[PDB]
Design an enzyme around this catalytic site. Structure first.
Site, PDB file in Angstrom:
ATOM      1  N   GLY A  24      51.527  40.959  38.487  1.00  0.00           N
ATOM      2  CA  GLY A  24      50.142  41.202  38.678  1.00  0.00           C
ATOM      3  C   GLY A  24      49.358  39.877  38.366  1.00  0.00           C
ATOM      4  O   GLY A  24      49.949  38.759  38.122  1.00  0.00           O
ATOM      5  N   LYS A  25      48.133  40.136  39.113  1.00  0.00           N
ATOM      6  CA  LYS A  25      47.145  39.050  39.020  1.00  0.00           C
ATOM      7  C   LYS A  25      46.501  38.804  37.487  1.00  0.00           C
ATOM      8  O   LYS A  25      46.688  39.686  36.527  1.00  0.00           O
ATOM      9  CB  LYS A  25      46.019  39.118  39.693  1.00  0.00           C
ATOM     10  CG  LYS A  25      45.917  38.531  41.113  1.00  0.00           C
ATOM     11  CD  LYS A  25      47.343  39.018  41.862  1.00  0.00           C
ATOM     12  CE  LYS A  25      46.908  38.863  43.373  1.00  0.00           C
ATOM     13  NZ  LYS A  25      46.646  37.646  44.150  1.00  0.00           N
ATOM     14  N   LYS A  30      48.774  34.202  39.559  1.00  0.00           N
ATOM     15  CA  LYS A  30      49.928  35.189  40.005  1.00  0.00           C
ATOM     16  C   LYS A  30      50.968  35.249  39.011  1.00  0.00           C
ATOM     17  O   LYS A  30      51.265  34.248  38.570  1.00  0.00           O
ATOM     18  CB  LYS A  30      50.309  35.171  41.536  1.00  0.00           C
ATOM     19  CG  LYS A  30      49.525  35.888  42.588  1.00  0.00           C
ATOM     20  CD  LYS A  30      49.672  34.960  43.863  1.00  0.00           C
ATOM     21  CE  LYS A  30      50.638  35.557  44.786  1.00  0.00           C
ATOM     22  NZ  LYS A  30      50.708  34.553  45.986  1.00  0.00           N
ATOM     23  N   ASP A 140      37.733  36.236  23.631  1.00  0.00           N
ATOM     24  CA  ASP A 140      37.843  37.323  24.441  1.00  0.00           C
ATOM     25  C   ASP A 140      39.088  38.357  23.931  1.00  0.00           C
ATOM     26  O   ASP A 140      40.171  38.853  24.752  1.00  0.00           O
ATOM     27  CB  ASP A 140      38.300  36.868  25.616  1.00  0.00           C
ATOM     28  CG  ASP A 140      38.139  37.930  26.733  1.00  0.00           C
ATOM     29  OD1 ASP A 140      38.732  37.558  27.967  1.00  0.00           O
ATOM     30  OD2 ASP A 140      37.508  39.083  26.636  1.00  0.00           O
TER      31      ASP A 140
HETATM   32  C1  LIG Z   1      51.682  36.374  31.905  1.00  0.00           C
HETATM   33  C2  LIG Z   1      50.479  36.728  32.142  1.00  0.00           C
HETATM   34  C3  LIG Z   1      50.007  37.714  30.772  1.00  0.00           C
HETATM   35  C4  LIG Z   1      50.278  37.029  29.496  1.00  0.00           C
HETATM   36  C5  LIG Z   1      49.666  36.137  29.009  1.00  0.00           C
HETATM   37  C6  LIG Z   1      48.395  35.715  29.350  1.00  0.00           C
HETATM   38  N1  LIG Z   1      47.608  34.984  29.671  1.00  0.00           N
HETATM   39  N2  LIG Z   1      50.132  36.056  27.626  1.00  0.00           N
HETATM   40  C7  LIG Z   1      51.227  36.750  27.698  1.00  0.00           C
HETATM   41  N3  LIG Z   1      51.324  37.492  28.887  1.00  0.00           N
HETATM   42  C8  LIG Z   1      52.170  38.461  29.398  1.00  0.00           C
HETATM   43  C9  LIG Z   1      53.261  38.902  28.694  1.00  0.00           C
HETATM   44  N4  LIG Z   1      54.097  39.842  29.294  1.00  0.00           N
HETATM   45  C10 LIG Z   1      53.503  40.737  30.156  1.00  0.00           C
HETATM   46  N5  LIG Z   1      54.427  41.665  30.527  1.00  0.00           N
HETATM   47  C11 LIG Z   1      54.439  42.604  31.684  1.00  0.00           C
HETATM   48  C12 LIG Z   1      53.147  42.785  32.403  1.00  0.00           C
HETATM   49  C13 LIG Z   1      53.142  43.637  33.362  1.00  0.00           C
HETATM   50  C14 LIG Z   1      54.244  44.509  33.649  1.00  0.00           C
HETATM   51  C15 LIG Z   1      54.429  45.389  34.693  1.00  0.00           C
HETATM   52  O1  LIG Z   1      54.942  46.287  34.648  1.00  0.00           O
HETATM   53  N6  LIG Z   1      53.471  45.196  35.931  1.00  0.00           N
HETATM   54  C16 LIG Z   1      53.545  46.223  36.853  1.00  0.00           C
HETATM   55  C17 LIG Z   1      51.907  46.375  37.074  1.00  0.00           C
HETATM   56  C18 LIG Z   1      51.833  47.565  38.256  1.00  0.00           C
HETATM   57  N7  LIG Z   1      52.466  47.027  39.708  1.00  0.00           N
HETATM   58  C19 LIG Z   1      52.196  48.083  40.609  1.00  0.00           C
HETATM   59  C20 LIG Z   1      53.786  46.580  39.532  1.00  0.00           C
HETATM   60  C21 LIG Z   1      53.819  45.485  38.351  1.00  0.00           C
HETATM   61  C22 LIG Z   1      55.677  44.297  33.000  1.00  0.00           C
HETATM   62  C23 LIG Z   1      55.359  43.491  31.846  1.00  0.00           C
HETATM   63  O2  LIG Z   1      56.536  43.097  31.155  1.00  0.00           O
HETATM   64  C24 LIG Z   1      57.831  43.474  31.641  1.00  0.00           C
HETATM   65  N8  LIG Z   1      52.572  40.180  30.567  1.00  0.00           N
HETATM   66  C25 LIG Z   1      51.647  39.494  30.510  1.00  0.00           C
HETATM   67  N9  LIG Z   1      50.451  39.126  31.164  1.00  0.00           N
HETATM   68  C26 LIG Z   1      50.117  40.108  32.077  1.00  0.00           C
HETATM   69  C27 LIG Z   1      48.567  39.755  32.396  1.00  0.00           C
HETATM   70  C28 LIG Z   1      48.614  40.813  33.806  1.00  0.00           C
HETATM   71  C29 LIG Z   1      49.743  40.309  34.491  1.00  0.00           C
HETATM   72  C30 LIG Z   1      50.731  39.979  33.539  1.00  0.00           C
END
Ligand SMILES: CC[C@@H]1c2c(C#N)ncn2-c2cnc(Nc3ccc(C(=O)NC4CCN(C)CC4)cc3OC)nc2N1C1CCCC1
Ligand SMILES: [Zn+2]
Length: 294
Positions: A24-25, A30, A140
């Site tokens: 995701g964003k 990205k 935040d």
């Molecule tokens: C790296 C940036 C931030 C993040 C930060 C920051 N800044 N620090 C740690 N993290 C993250 C750590 N872990 C994760 N883990 C997961 C996040 C999402 C999914 C998932 O299922 N997404 C589906 C959503 C619906 N779509 C239709 C399909 C995809 C799965 C995950 O782990 C298997 N995400 C972190 N984020 C997130 C913030 C939003 C985008 C990544």
């Protein structure tokens, strides 16, 4: 269009990460599951194009984000594993938290049970004690930034609004960004510091227990209006010990709030059940915390 590479190579460290599932964003970023070529270890990759970093101020923020985050290591903070760049992109390698965040939990479960709240809040607090001890204000803290690993352990992430206190009694005058649970001293532009995070933790506690945020309205400015006035109310079905703690954290004057170090010694923690761990069923079903199975 400027394409993101299928493989990300850190020329300095000589590590190569294979870009996998899109996550995701994350603002300009990205995000993808990325995995190391030698070790096969899987990380969360934050890819942000330099085409959105044309302005020094935008670059400085990201530079600081990394600066702050690279210096941190704690059980309840998202592991910083590295960063690097080519001429088109900035890549930041972070701990993959496979259970996503508390925001995703909140949307499935709404209000949690008290001991779940106690469980998550304690980990949120331990992580923030750590930050404050290292002179870092997150600024935040929200559900979306409170990630959960495979064992439902909380990991504070996203240091994009974070700031380092450089001298004792420093009132930060500026906060470029709009936090979710934004403290009244920020909104009034009076100058702020650590108590901003305790505010947010107050809102988070409320949200976790009540099932909705304390100052929510349909207009963001009407919401900021209410924060200024300290215009919230705790439903009656909330226990008074919990309610009491919320009230201490959500006071307009920052000096009246408990410090981060006071918190775990509150009745709310010390005289209530705190699970050692939560089962994965907790993502979906409310836990009853039975004394023996059938
Ligand atoms: C790296 C940036 C931030 C993040 C930060 C920051 N800044 N620090 C740690 N993290 C993250 C750590 N872990 C994760 N883990 C997961 C996040 C999402 C999914 C998932 O299922 N997404 C589906 C959503 C619906 N779509 C239709 C399909 C995809 C799965 C995950 O782990 C298997 N995400 C972190 N984020 C997130 C913030 C939003 C985008 C990544
Ligand atoms: Zn700015």
């Amino acid at each position: 269009a400027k394409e993101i590479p299928e493989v990300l190579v850190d020329p300095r460290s000589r590590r190569r990460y294979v870009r996998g599932r899109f996550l995701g964003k994350g603002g300009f970023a990205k995000c993808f599951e990325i995995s190391d070529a030698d070790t096969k270890e899987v990380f969360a990759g934050k890819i942000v194009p330099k085409s959105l970093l044309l302005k020094p101020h935008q670059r400085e923020k990201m530079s600081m984000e990394i600066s702050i985050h690279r210096s941190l290591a704690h059980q309840h903070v998202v592991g910083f594993h590295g960063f690097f760049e080519d001429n088109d992109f900035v890549f930041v390698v972070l701990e993959l938290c496979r259970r996503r965040s508390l925001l995703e939990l909140h949307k499935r479960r709404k209000a949690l049970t008290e001991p779940e709240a106690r469980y998550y809040l304690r980990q949120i607090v331990l992580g923030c004690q750590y930050l404050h001890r290292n002179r870092v204000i997150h600024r935040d803290l929200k559900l979306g930034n409170l990630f959960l690993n495979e064992d439902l352990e909380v990991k504070i992430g996203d240091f994009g609004l974070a700031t380092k206190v450089e001298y004792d009694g420093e009132r930060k005058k500026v906060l470029c960004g709009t936090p979710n649970y934004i403290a009244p001293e920020v909104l009034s532009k009076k100058g702020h510091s650590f108590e901003v995070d305790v505010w947010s933790i107050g809102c988070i506690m409320y949200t976790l227990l009540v099932g909705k945020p304390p100052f929510e309205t349909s207009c963001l400015k009407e919401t900021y209006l209410r924060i200024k006035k300290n215009e919230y109310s705790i439903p009656k079905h909330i226990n008074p010990v919990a309610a009491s703690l919320i009230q201490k954290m959500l006071q307009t004057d920052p000096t009246a709030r408990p410090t981060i170090n006071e918190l775990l010694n509150d009745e709310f923690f010390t005289s209530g059940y705190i699970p050692a761990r939560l089962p994965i069923t907790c993502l979906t079903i409310p836990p009853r915390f039975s004394i023996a199975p059938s």
